[PDB]
Amino acid sequence: AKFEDKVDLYDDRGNLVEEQVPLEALSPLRNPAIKSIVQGIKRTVAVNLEGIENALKTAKVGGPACKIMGRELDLDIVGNAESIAAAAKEMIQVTEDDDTNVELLGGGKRALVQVPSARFDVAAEYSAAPLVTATAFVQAIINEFDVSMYDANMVKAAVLGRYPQSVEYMGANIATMLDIPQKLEGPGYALRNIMVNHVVAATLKNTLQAAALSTILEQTAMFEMGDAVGAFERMHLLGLAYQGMNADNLVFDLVKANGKEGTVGSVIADLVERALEDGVIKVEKELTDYKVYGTDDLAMWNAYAAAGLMAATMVNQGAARAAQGVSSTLLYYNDLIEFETGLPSVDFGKVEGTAVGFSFFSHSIYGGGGPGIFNGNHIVTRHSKGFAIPCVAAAMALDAGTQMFSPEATSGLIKEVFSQVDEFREPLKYVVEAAAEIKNEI
Amino acid sequence: AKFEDKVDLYDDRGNLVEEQVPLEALSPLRNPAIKSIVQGIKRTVAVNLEGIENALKTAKVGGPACKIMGRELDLDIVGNAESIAAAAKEMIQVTEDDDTNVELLGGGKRALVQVPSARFDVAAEYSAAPLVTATAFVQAIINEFDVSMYDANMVKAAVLGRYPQSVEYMGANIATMLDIPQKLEGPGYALRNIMVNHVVAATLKNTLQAAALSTILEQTAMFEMGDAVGAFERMHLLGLAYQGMNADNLVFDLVKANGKEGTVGSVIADLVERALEDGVIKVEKELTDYKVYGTDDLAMWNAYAAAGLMAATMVNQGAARAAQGVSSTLLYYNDLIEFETGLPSVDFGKVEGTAVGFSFFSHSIYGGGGPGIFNGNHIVTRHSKGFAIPCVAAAMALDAGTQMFSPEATSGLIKEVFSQVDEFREPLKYVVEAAAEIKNEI
Amino acid sequence: AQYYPGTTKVAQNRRNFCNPEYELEKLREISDEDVVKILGHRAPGEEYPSVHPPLEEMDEPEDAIREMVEPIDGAKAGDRVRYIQFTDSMYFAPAQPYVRSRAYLCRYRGADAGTLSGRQIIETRERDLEKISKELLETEFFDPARSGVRGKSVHGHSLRLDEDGMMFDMLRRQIYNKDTGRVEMVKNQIGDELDEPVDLGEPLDEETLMEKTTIYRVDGEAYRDDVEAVEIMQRIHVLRSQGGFNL
Amino acid sequence: ADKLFINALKKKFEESPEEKKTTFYTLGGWKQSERKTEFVNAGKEVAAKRGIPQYNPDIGTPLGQRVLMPYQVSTTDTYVEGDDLHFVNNAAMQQMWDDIRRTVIVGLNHAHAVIEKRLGKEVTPETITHYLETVNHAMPGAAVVQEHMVETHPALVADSYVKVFTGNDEIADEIDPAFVIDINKQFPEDQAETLKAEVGDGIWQVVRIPTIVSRTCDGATTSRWSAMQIGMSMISAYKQAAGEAATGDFAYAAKHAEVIHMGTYLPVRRARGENEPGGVPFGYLADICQSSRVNYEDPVRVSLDVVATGAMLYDQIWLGSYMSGGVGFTQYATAAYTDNILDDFTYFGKEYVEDKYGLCEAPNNMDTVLDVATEVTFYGLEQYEEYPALLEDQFGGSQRAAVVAAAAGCSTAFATGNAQTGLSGWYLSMYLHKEQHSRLGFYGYDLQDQCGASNVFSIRGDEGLPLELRGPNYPNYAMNVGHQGEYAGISQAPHAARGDAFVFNPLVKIAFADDNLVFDFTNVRGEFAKGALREFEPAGERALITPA
Ligand code: F43
Ligand code: F43
Ligand SMILES: C[C@@H](OP(=O)(O)O)[C@H](NC(=O)CCCCCCS)C(=O)O
Ligand SMILES: C[C@@H](OP(=O)(O)O)[C@H](NC(=O)CCCCCCS)C(=O)O
Ligand SMILES: O=S(=O)(O)CCS
Ligand code: NA
Numbered sequence A, B: 001a002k003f004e005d006k007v008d009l010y011d012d013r014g015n016l017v018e019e020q021v022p023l024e025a026l027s028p029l030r031n032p033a034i035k036s037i038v039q040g041i042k043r044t045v046a047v048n049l050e051g052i053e054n055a056l057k058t059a060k061v062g063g064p065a066c067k068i069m070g071r072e073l074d075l076d077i078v079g080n081a082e083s084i085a086a087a088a089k090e091m092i093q094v095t096e097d098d099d100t101n102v103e104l105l106g107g108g109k110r111a112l113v114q115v116p117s118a119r120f121d122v123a124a125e126y127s128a129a130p131l132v133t134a135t136a137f138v139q140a141i142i143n144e145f146d147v148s149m150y151d152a153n154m155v156k157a158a159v160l161g162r163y164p165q166s167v168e169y170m171g172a173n174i175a176t177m178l179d180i181p182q183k184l185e186g187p188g189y190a191l192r193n194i195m196v197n198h199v200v201a202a203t204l205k206n207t208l209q210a211a212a213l214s215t216i217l218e219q220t221a222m223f224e225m226g227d228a229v230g231a232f233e234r235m236h237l238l239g240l241a242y243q244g245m246n247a248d249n250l251v252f253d254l255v256k257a258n259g260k261e262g263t264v265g266s267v268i269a270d271l272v273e274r275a276l277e278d279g280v281i282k283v284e285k286e287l288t289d290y291k292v293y294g295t296d297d298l299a300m301w302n303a304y305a306a307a308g309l310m311a312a313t314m315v316n317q318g319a320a321r322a323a324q325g326v327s328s329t330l331l332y333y334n335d336l337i338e339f340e341t342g343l344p345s346v347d348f349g350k351v352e353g354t355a356v357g358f359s360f361f362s363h364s365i366y367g368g369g370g371p372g373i374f375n376g377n378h379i380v381t382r383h384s385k386g387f388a389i390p391c392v393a394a395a396m397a398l399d400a401g402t403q404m405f406s407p408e409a410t411s412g413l414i415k416e417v418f419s420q421v422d423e424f425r426e427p428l429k430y431v432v433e434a435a436a437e438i439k440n441e442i
Numbered sequence C: 001a002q003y004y005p006g007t008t009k010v011a012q013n014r015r016n017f018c019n020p021e022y023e024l025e026k027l028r029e030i031s032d033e034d035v036v037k038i039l040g041h042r043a044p045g046e047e048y049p050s051v052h053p054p055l056e057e058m059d060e061p062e063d064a065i066r067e068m069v070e071p072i073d074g075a076k077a078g079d080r081v082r083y084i085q086f087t088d089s090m091y092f093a094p095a096q097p098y099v100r101s102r103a104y105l106c107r108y109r110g111a112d113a114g115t116l117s118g119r120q121i122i123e124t125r126e127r128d129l130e131k132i133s134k135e136l137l138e139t140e141f142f143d144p145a146r147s148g149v150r151g152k153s154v155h156g157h158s159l160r161l162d163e164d165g166m167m168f169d170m171l172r173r174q175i176y177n178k179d180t181g182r183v184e185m186v187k188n189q190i191g192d193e194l195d196e197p198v199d200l201g202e203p204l205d206e207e208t209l210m211e212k213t214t215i216y217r218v219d220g221e222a223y224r225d226d227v228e229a230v231e232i233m234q235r236i237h238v239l240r241s242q243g244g245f246n247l
Numbered sequence D: 001a002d003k004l005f006i007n008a009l010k011k012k013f014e015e016s017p018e019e020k021k022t023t024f025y026t027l028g029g030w031k032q033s034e035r036k037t038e039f040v041n042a043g044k045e046v047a048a049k050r051g052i053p054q055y056n057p058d059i060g061t062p063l064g065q066r067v068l069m070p071y072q073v074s075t076t077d078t079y080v081e082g083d084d085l086h087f088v089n090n091a092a093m094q095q096m097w098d099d100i101r102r103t104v105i106v107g108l109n110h111a112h113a114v115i116e117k118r119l120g121k122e123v124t125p126e127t128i129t130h131y132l133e134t135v136n137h138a139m140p141g142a143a144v145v146q147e148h149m150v151e152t153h154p155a156l157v158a159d160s161y162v163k164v165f166t167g168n169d170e171i172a173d174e175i176d177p178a179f180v181i182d183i184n185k186q187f188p189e190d191q192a193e194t195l196k197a198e199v200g201d202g203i204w205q206v207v208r209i210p211t212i213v214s215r216t217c218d219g220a221t222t223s224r225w226s227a228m229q230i231g232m233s234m235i236s237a238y239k240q241a242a243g244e245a246a247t248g249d250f251a252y253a254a255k256h257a258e259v260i261h262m263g264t265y266l267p268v269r270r271a272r273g274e275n276e277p278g279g280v281p282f283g284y285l286a287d288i289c290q291s292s293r294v295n296y297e298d299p300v301r302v303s304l305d306v307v308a309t310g311a312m313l314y315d316q317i318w319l320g321s322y323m324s325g326g327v328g329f330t331q332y333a334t335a336a337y338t339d340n341i342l343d344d345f346t347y348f349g350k351e352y353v354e355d356k357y358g359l360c361e362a363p364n365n366m367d368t369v370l371d372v373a374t375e376v377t378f379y380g381l382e383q384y385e386e387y388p389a390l391l392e393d394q395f396g397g398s399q400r401a402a403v404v405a406a407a408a409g410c411s412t413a414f415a416t417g418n419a420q421t422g423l424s425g426w427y428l429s430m431y432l433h434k435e436q437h438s439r440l441g442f443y444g445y446d447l448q449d450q451c452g453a454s455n456v457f458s459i460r461g462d463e464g465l466p467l468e469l470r471g472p473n474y475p476n477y478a479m480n481v482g483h484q485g486e487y488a489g490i491s492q493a494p495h496a497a498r499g500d501a502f503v504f505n506p507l508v509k510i511a512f513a514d515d516n517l518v519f520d521f522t523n524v525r526g527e528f529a530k531g532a533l534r535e536f537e538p539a540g541e542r543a544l545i546t547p548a
């Protein structure tokens, strides 16, 4: 009731799911599926039982190349995974009938853990997930093999690494999609510090699902950061809808029209036509053989331009089946559209700016790396407020194997565990369903 | 319930409230009042409208002694506080009927803000409170006076300070009891980084309420840290109950018995007698004119010893009406009770250790300060897992004015705003009433 | 209360210092004025400075703990919190650092005691500090050769003695007179010269020092030979160790 | 015959070490000392030159009412005044820290995989040698690609270079030996076998950036500086485009994916980046010290060389400057590496363990802890009682507590072959010491020692950790003198007794087995003595670019 805007919601095959959905039914503040995805990511931990066992057997604990000779412990952890996981769940759970989940994977080599939401209802942040899980498994392992008081500290090192000497869980054999709160670039950044490769791993390289999960996380962070409060709220909601949710099938149709032979430039031409066709922009002024476009709704123009940006990435990096050029697409889509229209590009220049540094720091000596290691909390790619990173997720999903630091290399544990969770793997399906559910509640 | 223990609950006048309550009715994970206190502290912000106005009128923004000549803005913020507060609330709220609270204090010089809980249901941590509040008031002030695009950045500086050039809100004119997530000594430490003076200010120097709020925060942190999981959960719950909640009226009665003429030593003698009377300890072995005591229940012994520790602080620092000696009490209560009994002191030596460093860093050149500036996240006083800081809160509550860095000097804004909230000010009342309410769901 | 384990004279002396029902042997008489001179916080006849208003003239919060705990006189008056600090020679001084702090918090109300190797300190409200200091200076807590009142420059607890059997003092606050066999305090505890010296009496002889001392030494009573005292300390170590692992 | 500390005590005092009485006050105050006289004269000149009062012996209390002692640097015959062991006055101590701060270890394994897999080019012992000649031009701050580059003066940065090591002897043989840390040359046979097995076919660079840069900037500069010049040299040697997508892979590998920092970054209250002393774990410090590879037949010598390394770094520079400053903590540290005192105590404990159990043959339990730690503690404390000169020498309780507990902990670890029971012995020693003398250390010395017993075998989040993994940022340990260097020694103790080639990280062990370092890590106490005598020549001086 705050905004009048309504969108049509589609699936990742381009079929209409639900027509005439109020914009706010997609808000992180309102949509129960986004709430569930965020609370799930806070409470979910991957445990590498095989890694713990191997670390103990070899006394290789506490970080790269580290080993303590004489401290080796040979414990049949994976062989007793069922009993250990059950013991761990008993400590992790608050009550017998809560939403604690502990599931063995890979024949007991891995475990999916979801710490009960009750623990987070009385927590300041999210670190309860790794810390409660870590100590439950440390205690479960010690209890299983009756590990002596004298040796038990090795089990702790095998599970959580060099913490607390290191600030991070250095050498740990558990993993989360979130990182520790100390590593935030600013207050409110926690949902931005999720590696692009983790998102692509969790969605199993489904391009539209990867784009969706990334946009949900990025735009939800924009609310926690206060960026989507007051004057800017509608712009952020429209960005979520059109860039990440494939609202009105705009991204899907721009890709369909340009997939066979198209370029970034041809995607731009189609998007400007579509915006004009829908009355989002109109000719404000005629120069010499050049039309200057204007708009009475900058938030909607931004939304349309953002959808074109996502489509241009899918067309350009999809054609190459190589992700590296996404930094170029993000730059020149926006550079070209401004000189094509006389209107500001996505996020008023901020996507172009992010892309300039992103290009530099993925083609130079100074830092960064491949597209997959960036995230909204990275100093290079934090500047656009939710409009750049989703395209990087799309690009990495489309990569056919050109990257050294791929999801397979950086996010194997995340892939095996976090992809088991349906709402992480197919977030678009659930957010669309929920938005339809609360449709006439807005 | 996981545990068999039951406790009798008392109020701050030492009167019986409820008999035979299951221990876990006081658990942070189960007690609705503790949940309400934690969620309340996460979402509550103090706004100094007078400070914002003075900062703008003088262009003194961005930290101590800082000033930009030529940037002065003469805005009647306090005179228009009602309009500004109403505008800010419209941006802070998610819906019209939700639990957003914006209340003016001091004739409009201050505002109590409670950011709606729906914003935190979809957030990773707690920084949404200051960030959403700050931007709502910045936008409200700009809209109120039609501040130009050219000058509006001064309003932002006056509200939130030098952020983001500084990591903290350096020079900000808003305050919370929590600090920024980057300043955590470790994951799970957020509820520990609340200054002792803040707790004493919020509870209006009521000793038992100060001790209670402090214990609730400390032990709730112990759950988020994973310390109160599995083998150690009962010890932490019993500590919460007996040291912080005056379970069985033990703290109260020890103080009553030793208030008129007693010392730390006489409290110890009474506690050991009571532990023997209640069957918590028993003579294990007789040496020459010396009885060695043992126990079948270390956790309960620890709880009894912790109750005596709190009472010893109240008697010693209460007699001096001066807080500084609390570091000495924390040390020598534990040092004495070990040689009196042959049993380990509170937290198995960790309170005594904390006390040693605490004494040093409150009586030397190297750092620290007076008792009121410490907290569970301070490097000096983080070591005991919930059993030391509550005594420091009690001691500061009893201080008659011997401290330079008192609550009056460090926590004035916190006092005026946070003491308005009933559950912050009288936590012992509300936590006890909640425990009685959920008595038979545990 | 039983206070401390052990079957040595050292162990018994440690128990005695802690036990409020044990009457500390008074060895010397010191006037009120001279205690004030040694402390050096104010002049004799000078009114007590205050750090806050009298408790009666303030609106204290409604507080059952405040109602049950009786403030010491100095707290009622709003006195400054001041100190007295002692150094004890490891050559058989009667009192020693931890024995002092343990004893202080058994005997005295409203006390802030601190233990270090070369000094030990108590801070409390000024007028109560004066009453406590009298007992600390007059009784077997104090020997004028093996103990020193020192607010700064405390070096000496571990040093060899001088020819007279006096502990080292960088500021020489306590002077032994070879002609008279008596010790006078010529400066206050911070090291400023006194108008008129304070007699602190004769040093205790070797036999009396051995009878009264609370330090274990191979040439006195060795700690390793007080096996019951050692046993309890080892018991504490073990129970703390086990407790940190599981409860 | 004598206790090992007797010569030192005899050199300090006119009296025999056993004598209980002495003479004070008539020594002339500061005038008794050559060093204090130099300081007084210097203070007058400084004050006059700058127009502000500075050093003045008449300010505050008058030093030198007792004998101002010389100190013997343990295992040497060098006797110096304590001022010569202050880190500000000792260039050897400053250079030891600079040599650690300016070092990073960077793998070539990911880098070589990018070259072969992403670029499709070959890596051979020949391409590696070419790369190494390139990076040794580039690393000190010189150019390889662009026109009109300005460069660092080679003489100012002469201490910067890059070497490699690998467990594969044949490959190491094929690389120019000027660039190779020869594991078979530097380590005894059995140790070399262990280290090569740990490294395998991995190839690792040891990068040392210029001391002058490390001093101008900070420790967090090291891995970045390293990465920049590795990057340039990869471009130059392997013929990439000078700035293509693959270039980013090399940056991420060198800065993150295959980098070993000497120290990890620290929390906000003591905010510091990587490669600062607080981030160096005790296991790393033990491995940085090279006593293990030259003194392997003497486990006490090895352990105590590590104690000297850590006492100086952690107490004098880290706690005494980074974390505080001023006059600082020279003698809190010198207690652990002077007058052969800790040596005497620890050789006693070694012999006790050797006679009763045999090294590493005691049960790894509390029974052994109670036995060895108690016995060694009682020995140490009895020496202070029997020798009044020793007690006057180590006059601060903190200094005696650290020395006695260090001997007790190392000896317990000699017995069990496990550092954790060694740590338990350290804490027991403190408890016994406190009760024996009714004192221990300074006001806040035993914060960690009271938490100690319960946290040795704890498994909880910020409590549980093998000692080797602990360091100056382990919460209990984060504040106080007289512990950190001694813990490094206890970390080394069981491994020295076992004959292990390393304590925690084999790459770090090999990385400092390098004759091209400025500080000699095989003889730490010898170097401290050389610095005390003003005979050590540090890197990083600006004499070349300043007036005569
Ligand atoms: C002012 C304090 C309180 C505090 O915060 N720090 C001091 C002072 C400080 C100053 C003294 C410099 C100066 O004189 O101007 C320095 C050097 C730190 C600095 N600012 O550079 C220091 N202590 Ni302290 N401090 C030390 C010691 C100690 C020992 C000295 C006992 C004795 O009998 O002499 C006692 C603690 C104890 O009793 O255990 C001690 C106390 C104190 N320590 C008492 C002053 C004591 C006095 O009045 O004489 N230090 C030592 O035990 C040995 C090492 C020694 C440090 C310098 C070095 O390591 O070379 C020094 C370390
Ligand atoms: C390898 C890279 C990619 C990268 O990550 N950094 C490089 C190289 C790096 C090296 C070159 C040192 C060497 O030659 O060994 C250093 C000195 C950084 C370092 N590692 O110390 C540098 N660049 Ni670059 N770099 C510079 C510059 C530039 C200009 C040079 C344009 C021209 O026409 O000459 C271009 C960028 C541009 O086109 O705008 C450039 C590119 C590049 N820059 C291309 C190499 C270009 C080439 O093949 O020649 N630098 C400059 O524009 C001026 C300052 C100059 C820097 C040195 C200094 O400030 O004195 C230097 C700064
Ligand atoms: C991006 C970031 O690098 P990483 O991606 O974290 O490796 C960052 N570098 C820099 O910003 C280097 C900046 C100076 C060199 C480029 C100048 S244009 C740093 O080291 O913290
Ligand atoms: C406690 C803390 O000080 P603050 O309370 O934060 O001022 C800390 N200091 C230290 O730990 C100083 C330690 C070295 C000097 C004392 C040695 S025993 C620091 O500066 O970060
Ligand atoms: O006297 S204190 O223990 O506070 C400082 C010792 S250097
Ligand atoms: Na009298």
Ligand SMILES: [Zn+2]
Pocket (backbone or CB within 6 Å): D214, D215, D216, D217, D218
């Ligand atoms: Zn520097």
